[PDB]
Amino acid sequence: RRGRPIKQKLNPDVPMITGQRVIDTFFPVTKGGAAAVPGPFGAGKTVVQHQIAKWSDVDLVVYVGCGERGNEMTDVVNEFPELIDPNTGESLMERTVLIANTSNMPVAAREASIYTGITIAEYFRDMGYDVAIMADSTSRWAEALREMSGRLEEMPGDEGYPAYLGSRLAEYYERSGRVIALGSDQREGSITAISAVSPS
Amino acid sequence: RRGRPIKQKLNPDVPMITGQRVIDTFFPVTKGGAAAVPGPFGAGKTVVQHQIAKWSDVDLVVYVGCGERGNEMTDVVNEFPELIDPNTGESLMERTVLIANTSNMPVAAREASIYTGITIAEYFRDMGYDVAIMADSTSRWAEALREMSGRLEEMPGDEGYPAYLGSRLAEYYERSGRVIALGSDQREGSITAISAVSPS
Amino acid sequence: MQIGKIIKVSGPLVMAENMSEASIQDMCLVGDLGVIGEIIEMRQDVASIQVYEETSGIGPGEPVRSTGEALSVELGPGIISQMFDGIQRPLDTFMEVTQSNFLGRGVQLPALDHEKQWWFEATIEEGTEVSAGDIIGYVDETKIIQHKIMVPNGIKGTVQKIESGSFTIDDPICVIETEQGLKELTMMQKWPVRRGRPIKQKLNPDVPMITGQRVIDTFFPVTKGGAAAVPGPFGAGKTVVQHQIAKWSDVDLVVYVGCGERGNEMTDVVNEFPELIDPNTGESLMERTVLIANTSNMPVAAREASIYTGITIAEYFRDMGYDVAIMADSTSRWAEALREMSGRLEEMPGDEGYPAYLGSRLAEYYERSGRVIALGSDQREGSITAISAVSPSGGDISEPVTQNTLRVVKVFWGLDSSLAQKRHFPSINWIQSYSLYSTEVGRYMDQILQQDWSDMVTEGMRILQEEEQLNEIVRLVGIDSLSDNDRLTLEVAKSIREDYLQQNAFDDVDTFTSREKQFNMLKVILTFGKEARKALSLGAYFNEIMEGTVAVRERISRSKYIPEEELAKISSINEEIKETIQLIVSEG
Amino acid sequence: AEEIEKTRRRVNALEYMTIPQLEETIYYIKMKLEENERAEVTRLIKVKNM
Amino acid sequence: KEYRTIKEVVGPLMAVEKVSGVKYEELIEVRMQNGEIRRGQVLEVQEDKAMVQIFEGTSGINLKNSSVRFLGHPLQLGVSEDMIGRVFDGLGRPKDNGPEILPEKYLDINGEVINPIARDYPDEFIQTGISAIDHLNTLVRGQKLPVFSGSGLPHKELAAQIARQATVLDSSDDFAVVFAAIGITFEEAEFFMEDFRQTGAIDRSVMFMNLANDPAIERIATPRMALTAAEYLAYEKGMHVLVIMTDMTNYAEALREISAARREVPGRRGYPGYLYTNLATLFERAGRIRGLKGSVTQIPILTMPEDDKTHPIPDLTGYITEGQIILTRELYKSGIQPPIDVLPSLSRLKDKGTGAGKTREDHAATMNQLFAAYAQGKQAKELAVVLGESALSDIDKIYAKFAERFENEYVNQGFYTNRTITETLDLGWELLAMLPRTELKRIKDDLLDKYLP
Amino acid sequence: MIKEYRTIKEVVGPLMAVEKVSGVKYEELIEVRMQNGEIRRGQVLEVQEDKAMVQIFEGTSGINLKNSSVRFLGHPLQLGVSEDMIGRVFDGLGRPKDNGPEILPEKYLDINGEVINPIARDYPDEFIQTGISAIDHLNTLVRGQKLPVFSGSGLPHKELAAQIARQATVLDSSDDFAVVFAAIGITFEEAEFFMEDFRQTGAIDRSVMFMNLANDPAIERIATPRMALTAAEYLAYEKGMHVLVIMTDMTNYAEALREISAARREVPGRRGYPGYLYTNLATLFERAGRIRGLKGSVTQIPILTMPEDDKTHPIPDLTGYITEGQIILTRELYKSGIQPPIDVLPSLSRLKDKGTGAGKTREDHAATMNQLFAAYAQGKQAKELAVVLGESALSDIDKIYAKFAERFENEYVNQGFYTNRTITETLDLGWELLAMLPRTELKRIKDDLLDKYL
Ligand SMILES: Nc1ncnc2c1ncn2[C@@H]1O[C@H](COP(=O)(O)OP(=O)(O)O)[C@@H](O)[C@H]1O
Ligand SMILES: Nc1ncnc2c1ncn2[C@@H]1O[C@H](COP(=O)(O)OP(=O)(O)O)[C@@H](O)[C@H]1O
Ligand SMILES: Nc1ncnc2c1ncn2[C@@H]1O[C@H](COP(=O)(O)OP(=O)(O)O)[C@@H](O)[C@H]1O
Ligand SMILES: [Mg+2]
Ligand SMILES: [Mg+2]
Ligand SMILES: [Mg+2]
């Protein structure tokens, strides 16, 4: 829950490659940029995030399954070793880090899954790697906060969500971005945050 | 509040001749079935139920005046004796039981009217008779639950109504139906529920 | 006096012990700064107080003192041409004492000038019978407005001394002994803002107030002592209407209330009013105007009590015998104060956040307006005409404020947004709007002019309603078949809309048209429709008239700008119409 | 003539079917949102007392 | 039983401790420190504590130098038949410079529910003097027939007109009127009060005038005192009483304000959940009773907000009353007075009001033909002006002329024109005289040769 | 007078309780010394007898109740005011980030400020050249006005804000002009965008910046606008400068207001936002204008985003009730390539009539304005007739209007975010587009103006 220290936060210049036409052409995302994928159930948010996680020209990907289907996590560990891309003709599994927290898994562990994944992404950014962090979904994180806020009998903000929902989201994204890592080498790592929102 | 015991419940497949053309032809209700009559003021909810109360081919009729007009209860006790059952050729009042709790009568007492009515119907049902009960109106009953809820400082559900509203109703419409009554001879009786709903 | 001790401060919520002999709804002074507040609720010894100013730097231990009464205004000389605010704090006297262009906290000073000398000339003989509301003498605070010092309410009987001289509002100008005691009478009487001043009897307003606004005075008139409301969106033109009515109303006094307005709009009333010369007197409008100004960032209770302090002062001069007109703009931002204040009182919210007593507080305001006979054996008549301008979020009059307002007001001037653009001003919708005085006003003016004015107004409207019916016929089907007569009704209605309903408040002669002019203008338009339909039958086709009446309809269209002292020219238009359609009747 | 038919028929559809359904739906949802907000706010009032 | 034990004051509410022997809905009297007296009622009593709401609010009250006195009785009304020709306020206090009344007895204004089996069905006819009402939507003794209106509409004139034209064909003096004004402006009240004075209708009526600025609780108590007086005159003195009440919308808003003050959870559209039952405790107080001469008839007049009939106040009123009389802007614009739309309006008990002995033989027959023709006649009138002109098979064209004539000659009578049921029926035939004989199928051939010109 | 207590009773989420206190006032600044020595700042949100409810800005994580202490500073939020603030970048709480030396303050002022006496406020009487034709000509910004910009997420309201700050000026050179720029809830990238663009153009030397990020404490977010205005009222009403305040984003500010609201366990609230949202916006918006007999002025251009772009949202709706007009950004325009995407039809300036006319701008300013607005209105109208009936059905006059509306968008309002136009350049460009019209359609204007200006 504490962001790894940097030396300087930079402006993302280089466009990431997703392989998806509508994204790469009309709504592109840079390395260190932040993107959200809001939509109802069946929209295709999860598919898009897998698609980016498979064809991103970043060095490492980090997929966080926050309060989502367990099969979708099982799906990743199955095919990723079989798929060959993008460099050295090696497995996608040897460039990914998975953090699984299903919907029926305890609620409090949802917020942890988000904060653990971004910290790992911060860790590999410090050695000068372009890393992509997938959040699926940041709504369950908020739902977890809402459910816990009720049990503590706090005064909510809107739709049951705690009023500090705004500030806590701001913390997560400002931990991403292209930065110059601490040290003498002054390497450049980048955290591209591809988040998903599930609006009621 | 406790439904009278039965040996077995049976699926109603015998239609109930009301004399109402639109009903008997296109939207019929079986002996033991349940029908809801929701509509605005001046629609004919009361008239329909009266028509059912008058000319139906059932053994007994239990009419419940739940939070409605007093004139409509005076109208019944006067007219019904002067009317003749199109089958038995005798007065309608010789087969009907009236229960009246008008809108200006005690609010909490209009919940009891519903349960008082259905219990009498179950009683004659166990005799092997085909009974029919009219609820006018069930909306008023729901208001009594809502008002009593507010006095109890209960957590509001939908439109102010308590969360157990759907439960109470579902339990009420399950007390009707074609049954095999208790006894060695295993006789069969039934209750046909006609309920008027008055949505705003 | 009694002091108390703060024990809790959470935002505007302040609780204080030893508030034992304080009362409910008492104005009190919280903390060392002494910021104003009000006692909302009282639980045994502890009183919960809602502070109306910023509570930063205030905490437990600090003293709290009640003023000893509810929110009240000072009624006496030094009140006219003065610019108070919601709690009747003089803004000019403010600048002198604080030596600043800003408003600090805990800085409070008397409304009127107690140090000022006013000449008093008694009109009562000593030993004469007096009661509440009777006049003992007067002060010429200004011409025209003669400030009449009336006997305070609840005071009766004996009159031992009275004399004329240069006194102040503090010095005893009179002494009256009673069963209660022998008290000094001053030139000032305090009065609770919320509660209205009593009267002998309330009468029904039957005398229409001249506004100079054609659409109002003719079709939707307002009697003196009546009640009117102006609902509309942004740029509708309510503020213009308020200014127009404030300028040209045949009333003795004007009370302009700015409930919660933008500062840049508030300065206009501040500066333009002294620059506005008065009707036949020749002085500033401000010298017959009392101003209550409140910006948006002012204390919420100042923005809430605004209209009530105004109606209170209005009652005061009403009791003298003056016909008062109180201007309220805007009331939507007055009610915005209510919504905010009630939220802090943690009450059960009414419709869309507003208090459940919203319609009750509105009713308690508009009811305090009307033609009355004030207390006193003179049985003199006074009146208060309330003109409020409401501002719905998007012009939707389904607003809780507008709906509750239309329940008590008798005159409704609804401003269409579709008329706002295309520059149809005043944008008052002539179909949705109405007047509950229209019938009586029409028969009053049937005597002041001895003409079938009520018949003309009725025919004028009949033409307009028919137009709407004809309008949908045009839509659903097409412009044909015109039937000549129906297409003429459209042209007459178009003439009414453009040559009568529309008037520029910024034009130097169209900003005001008297009854004299209003009559002749309407008569010309109506007689055009009369003579055309009558010649249409035997026997002319529609655009034959339209071709021969080109220049004469231009004169009708320009009748608006015809000077008052040249009123005969409008009458000349009327009989030009009769000759021109016979000019082509023979031969056509 | 077919274009006049189509236009006229579309016009009749716009006035009798499309817009009235639209106005009535914009009224239902608007009131529905206004109701649920009153419900949630009312619920929040009781919670604050706890 | 006077106590100076006021513990708490919050808003209009007040808590009094160390009390005993007090009851629910018990009327109280709070004497303030300045001597001013304020009335109130018990909302709730628990332990030694008593929660009361003051009528005139709680402003300026010093809890420690003020005392509370419990009267040991609910809000009552001192009734007498000397009330005839007297103007009272919402709480039964004189408003006409008249001598205070010596009550023959006091009555709880809540009254009691008429036993459904003791109740007698509404019968016989009340002549309101208005063709649109008396003929098509007949009013009956003991019926609940309300008038649905809107702002700017002439329900005010319609109210006063009926009140001064209302009579029965019974006898000279056994009919009375109880006019209840609720939360209306003073101008509206003075209009009523003096129109009663001018026409002399005051001599047979009792008035309860409550204004918009009067406290909310006095606004909700007004109709209950009106019905209490009405029930006394009708059931104890055997009179046919007609009760006029307006505005019901003001009543609902007053009930709305009181509900929120008591921290009660609101129902649909911010109105109390018990809005139905509360309104029902007023309207159901009307009807005839077996063995008792006289009756209570109610005409509740209300304004429909945004002209929305689905609004809680009209919709719930419709769920209680036996029909309605609807005023429309479309007719008021046309200059129709009274602007009564006979299509969405209806009377349920008109069956008991019409018929030989009550009204003449063709009452029931003519209303069917007039209504049916008007339904077909208006659409004929409407389709003519929109589509085409004077091309309506020459049968709808005469229906169009019938509809317009029906609106301007039959319905539009004026607010100061009394139309007896005789004059109405005769006028109805003259309107049916336009049409060919084939159109009037609803009427048998016998009546036609007896009345039709 | 130290007032430091090791007394700490409770920590519930963001809030912290402290007993045995005295002399502690409402909204008083505090500092908490933790067991590891880590020092965090906070503020009193509620104080009752022998107790105090405070909220720690930087969170409460790691805080041990038994080994920690809380010191009361005995003063609310204040600003070290000075004239040396110009050319420097301050944060939410007026602390430097430009790595420069902290300022020796003339004095300290509360950030709440005082309410301007309405009888002391003067007319807003003259022009402010923003360099935007859509603004300077049709929706004029007068000196002392409060003219907000209505935008949405995705719309270029940051390029517009940056463009105004550089190009804004008074055309009398005998008046010191300054720009107070407040960033609220702003992400680092667009926060950097402002800071770098303020330096590359040398706008910093004329301006004072207040940068607050989204991840920074919500109390700082609330304090940021009041920090910017306190400076603005000093530079103007004490140092006699013409100050232009730019604030963005105002939606971010409102969200923080909601966050502190539920922290005090207050209840919503229209669409989630607290019931006092109106005043809370008024308390920082109404702090502008011109004061009588006082050189200098305060002018505000607050920029907010519309949630899903509807003007019925509380933030745009209530803002319109406090400000005189608004500038509306449209997604339709932006998608088509018009920069800046200013929709002229629904945008308004109520105080434009006073900032124009001879001596302020040219004589033809009001005539060209009304004509362009009308021609464009009927121009856009003629276009939607050409899509239903085809260009063949349009009259020759309407076809010109149709072509007018097109070029009015592509040339007149489509300046570009890096294209500064003077008031004269704008006016004459208006005539070039009015020359497009037939002479018979130009009879509306005074023939005096037609002759002198093309
Ligand atoms: N880019 C795509 N290509 C093909 N099919 C898709 C795509 N996106 C979604 N789908 C289909 O839609 C369904 C929704 O997928 P998913 O991402 O799980 O929805 P969401 O995550 O939005 O709830 C998938 O089962 C898939 O079959
Ligand atoms: N089947 C029917 N035949 C004839 N008239 C009817 C019929 N149903 C209803 N009506 C008319 O409609 C009115 C409404 O009757 P009622 O049943 O009391 O309405 P609801 O119960 O829907 O409030 C009655 O007064 C009656 O005149
Ligand atoms: N009667 C009128 N005559 C001429 N112009 C008017 C009139 N009423 C309004 N306007 C114009 O409409 C604009 C709106 O003015 P204002 O009264 O402030 O509207 P609102 O009060 O609705 O904000 C003004 O700038 C004015 O030029
Ligand atoms: Mg998914
Ligand atoms: Mg019914
Ligand atoms: Mg205005």
Strand-pair partners of F12: F15
In sequence order, which residues have a C-beta less than 8 Å from that of residue A80 and are 6 or more positions away? A54, A91, A92, A93, A96
**Interface-testing mutation among C89, C296, C347, C422, with chain F (most F C-beta atoms within 10 A):** C296
Chain breaks after residues in chain F, where C lies over 2.5 Å from next N: none
Which chains does chain E touch, 3 or more C-beta pairs < 8 A?
B, C, D
The amino acid present at A83, given as its one-letter code, is L
First to last CA, chain A: 27
What would the two tokens of residue D37 be?
A: 């907000």
Pairwise CB contact (< 8 Å): C264 & F317 = no
Q: Is there a contact between E11 and C39 (Cβ–Cβ < 8 Å)?
A: no
What is d(CA F17, CA F20) in angstroms, rounded to the nearest whole number? Answer: 11
**Interface-testing mutation among D11, D33, D35, D38, with chain C (most C C-beta atoms within 10 A):** D38
Residue labelled with tokens 């509404």? E122
Q: What angle do CA C5, F266, F32 make, to 5 degrees?
A: 70
Question: Which of E119, E264, E312 comes nearest B70 by C-beta?
Answer: E119
Phi/psi region, residue A44 (left: phi>0; alpha: psi -120 to 50; beta: rest), is left
Residues listed for chain E: 453
Residues C303 and C398 in one domain: yes
At CB < 8 Å, which residues of chain D contact A? Answer: 44, 47-48, 50
Residues C420 and C509 in one domain: no
Strand-pair partners of C147: C139
Query: Got the DSSP string for D1-50?
Result: -HHHHHHHHHHHHIIIIIHHHHHHHHHHHHHHHHHHHHHHHHHHHHHHH-
Phi, psi (5° rounding) for residue E198? -65, -50
Neighbours of F432 (CB within 10 A): 12
Residues C208 and C96 in one domain: yes
Helix (H) or strand (E) holding F382: helix F365-386
Q: Is there a contact between C472 and E387 (Cβ–Cβ < 8 Å)?
A: no
Neighbours of B56 (CB within 10 A): 24
Residues from chain D that touch B159, judged by Cβ atoms under 8 A, are 35, 39
Helix (H) or strand (E) holding E33: none
How far is B37 from chain E, CA to nearest CA, in Å? 15
**Interface-testing mutation among D10, D29, D41, D46, with chain F (most F C-beta atoms within 10 A):** D41
How far is F418 from chain C, CA to nearest CA, in Å? 32
Ligand nearest to the CA of B43: 2
What is d(CA F5, CA F72) in angstroms, rounded to the nearest whole number? Answer: 8
Q: Which of C468, C467, C491, C496 is closest to C545 using CA atoms?
A: C491
What is d(CA E3, CA E25) in angstroms, rounded to the nearest whole number? Answer: 18
Q: Which of F303, F379, F312 is closest to F342 using CA atoms?
A: F303
Q: Which of F74, F189, E430, F434 is closest to A34 using CA atoms?
A: F189
Asked whether A50 lines ligand 1 (CB < 6 A), one says: no
Question: Which of C83, C105, C339 comes nearest F119 by C-beta?
Answer: C83
How far is F179 from chain A, CA to nearest CA, in Å? 25
Strand F297-305 to strand F149-151: parallel, antiparallel, or no bridges (unpaired)?
parallel
In sequence order, which residues have a C-beta less than 8 Å from that of residue C46 and are 6 or more positions away? C7, C15, C16, C17, C19
Neighbours of F101 (CB within 10 A): 9
What would the two tokens of residue F224 be?
A: 């940021």
Q: What angle do CA F429, F431, F436 make, to 5 degrees?
A: 105
In sequence order, which residues have a C-beta less than 8 Å from that of residue A147 and are 6 or more positions away? A107
Pairwise CB contact (< 8 Å): D44 & F271 = no
In sequence order, which residues have a C-beta less than 8 Å from that of residue C245 and are 6 or more positions away? C211, C213, C325, C327, C387
Phi, psi (5° rounding) for residue F79? -125, 125
Q: Is C235 annotated as a binding residue?
A: yes
Neighbours of E303 (CB within 10 A): 24
Residues from chain B that touch E276, judged by Cβ atoms under 8 A, are 103, 140, 143
Phi/psi region, residue C484 (left: phi>0; alpha: psi -120 to 50; beta: rest), is left
Question: Which of A1, A11, A166 comes nearest F259 by C-beta?
Answer: A166
Q: Is F41 exposed, middle or buried (0-12, 13-18, 19+ CB in 10 A)?
A: middle
Q: Which of E282, E352, E346, E317 is closest to E120 using CA atoms?
A: E352
Residues from chain A that touch D44, judged by Cβ atoms under 8 A, are 155-156
Q: Is B162 annotated as a binding residue?
A: no
Pairwise CB contact (< 8 Å): D39 & B153 = no
In sequence order, which residues have a C-beta less than 8 Å from that of residue B42 and are 6 or more positions away? E318, E323, E346, E348
Q: Is B80 annotated as a binding residue?
A: no
Pairwise CB contact (< 8 Å): E266 & D42 = yes
Q: How far is the CA of F222 from the centre of ligand 6 (A)?
A: 29
Q: Is there a contact between E54 and E10 (Cβ–Cβ < 8 Å)?
A: no
What would the two tokens of residue F196 be?
A: 């770098």
Contacts 24+ apart (CB under 8 A), A21-25: A23/A52
Question: Which of E187, E249, E305 comes nearest C410 by C-beta?
Answer: E187
Is A167 part of the contact surface with chain F (CB cutoff 8 Å)?
Answer: yes
Q: Which of F296, F280, F311 is closest to F176 using CA atoms?
A: F296
Q: Is C233 annotated as a binding residue?
A: yes
Domain count for chain C = 4
What would the two tokens of residue C577 be?
A: 């119409």
User: What DSSP state is assigned to residue F319?
Assistant: H
Q: Chain-centre distance of CA B2, in angstroms?
A: 17
- Residue whose CB lies within 8 A of the most ligand 3 atoms, among C234, C240, C243, C503, for a mutation test: C240
Neighbours of F22 (CB within 10 A): 13
> Which method was used?
X-ray
What would the two tokens of residue E219 be?
A: 């606004």
What is d(CA C385, CA C310) in angstroms, rounded to the nearest whole number? Answer: 12
Query: What does this entry list as its resolution, in Å?
Result: 3.0
Neighbours of C144 (CB within 10 A): 15
Residues C125 and C249 in one domain: no
Out of C150, C185, C220, pick the residue that ends a domain: C185
Ligand nearest to the CA of A45: 1
The amino acid present at D2, given as its one-letter code, is E
What is d(CA C349, CA D45) in angstroms, rounded to the nearest whole number? Answer: 10
Q: How far is the CA of F44 from the centre of ligand 2 (A)?
A: 66
Residues from chain D that touch F265, judged by Cβ atoms under 8 A, are 48
What is d(CA C385, CA C224) in angstroms, rounded to the nearest whole number? Answer: 5
What is d(CA E401, CA E425) in angstroms, rounded to the nearest whole number? Answer: 19
**CATH value at residue B194:** 3.40.50.300
What would the two tokens of residue F366 be?
A: 């009001």
Longest dimension (CA), chain C: 99
Task: Please state the atom number of ligand 2 nearest to the C-alpha of residue B136.
Answer: 21
Is F275 part of the contact surface with chain D (CB cutoff 8 Å)?
Answer: no
Q: List b or e across E402-421, with b for residues whose CB sees 16 or more CB atoms inside 10 angstroms.
A: bbeebbeebbbbebeeebeb
Q: Is B42 annotated as a binding residue?
A: yes
Nearest CA in chain B to E346: B42
What is d(CA B62, CA B118) in angstroms, rounded to the nearest whole number? Answer: 8
Which chains does chain C touch, 3 or more C-beta pairs < 8 A?
D, E, F
Query: Got the DSSP string for C188-235?
Result: -EEEESSSPPP-SEE----SBPP-S-HIIIIIS--BTT-EEEEE--TT
What is d(CA B61, CA B42) in angstroms, rounded to the nearest whole number? Answer: 24
At CB < 8 Å, which residues of chain D contact F? Answer: 37, 41, 44-45, 48
Out of C435, C460, C477, pick the residue that ends a domain: C435
C-alpha torsion sign, points C119, C124, C127, C129: negative
Nearest CA in chain D to B157: D39
Alpha helices in B86-164 (DSSP H): 109-125, 138-151
**Interface-testing mutation among D44, D46, D50, with chain F (most F C-beta atoms within 10 A):** D44
Q: Which of F382, F238, F237 is closest to F297 using CA atoms?
A: F237
Q: Is B45 annotated as a binding residue?
A: yes
Neighbours of E436 (CB within 10 A): 8
Residues from chain C that touch E335, judged by Cβ atoms under 8 A, are 462
User: What DSSP state is assigned to residue B104?
Assistant: T
* Cis status, amide bond into B113, omega within 30 of 0: no
Q: Please tell me whether residue B155 adopts helix, strand or coil conformation.
A: coil
Residue labelled with tokens 């966080």? A64
Asked whether B19 lines ligand 2 (CB < 6 A), one says: no
In sequence order, which residues have a C-beta less than 8 Å from that of residue C282 and are 6 or more positions away? none
Pairwise CB contact (< 8 Å): E266 & D35 = no
Out of C17, C46, C71, pick the residue that ends a domain: C71
Ligand nearest to the CA of A50: 1
C-alpha torsion sign, points F434, F440, F446, F452: positive
Q: Is there a contact between A141 and A127 (Cβ–Cβ < 8 Å)?
A: no
Phi, psi (5° rounding) for residue C325? -125, 120
Strand-pair partners of C37: C28, C51
Q: Is C299 annotated as a binding residue?
A: no
In sequence order, which residues have a C-beta less than 8 Å from that of residue F92 and are 6 or more positions away? F210, F211, F212, F216, F217, F220, F221, F223, F224, F227
In sequence order, which residues have a C-beta less than 8 Å from that of residue C430 and are 6 or more positions away? C215, C219, C461, C464, C497, C501
Q: What is the CA radius of gyration of chain C?
A: 28
Residues from chain B that touch D42, judged by Cβ atoms under 8 A, are 156
The amino acid present at D41, given as its one-letter code, is V
What is d(CA F80, CA F93) in angstroms, rounded to the nearest whole number? Answer: 10
Nearest CA in chain C to D12: C476
Q: List b or e across E23-33, with b for residues whose CB sees 16 or more CB atoms inside 10 angstroms.
A: eeebbbebbbe
Domains of chain E: 1-453 (3.40.50.12240)
Neighbours of E194 (CB within 10 A): 13
C-alpha torsion sign, points F333, F334, F337, F341: positive
- Residue whose CB lies within 8 A of the most ligand 1 atoms, among A21, A22, A47, for a mutation test: A47
Q: Which domain holds residue B18?
A: 1-200
Neighbours of A7 (CB within 10 A): 10
Pairwise CB contact (< 8 Å): E116 & B200 = no
Give helix then strand counts, H and E, for chain A.
Answer: 6, 9
What is d(CA F440, CA F442) in angstroms, rounded to the nearest whole number? Answer: 5
Longest dimension (CA), chain A: 54
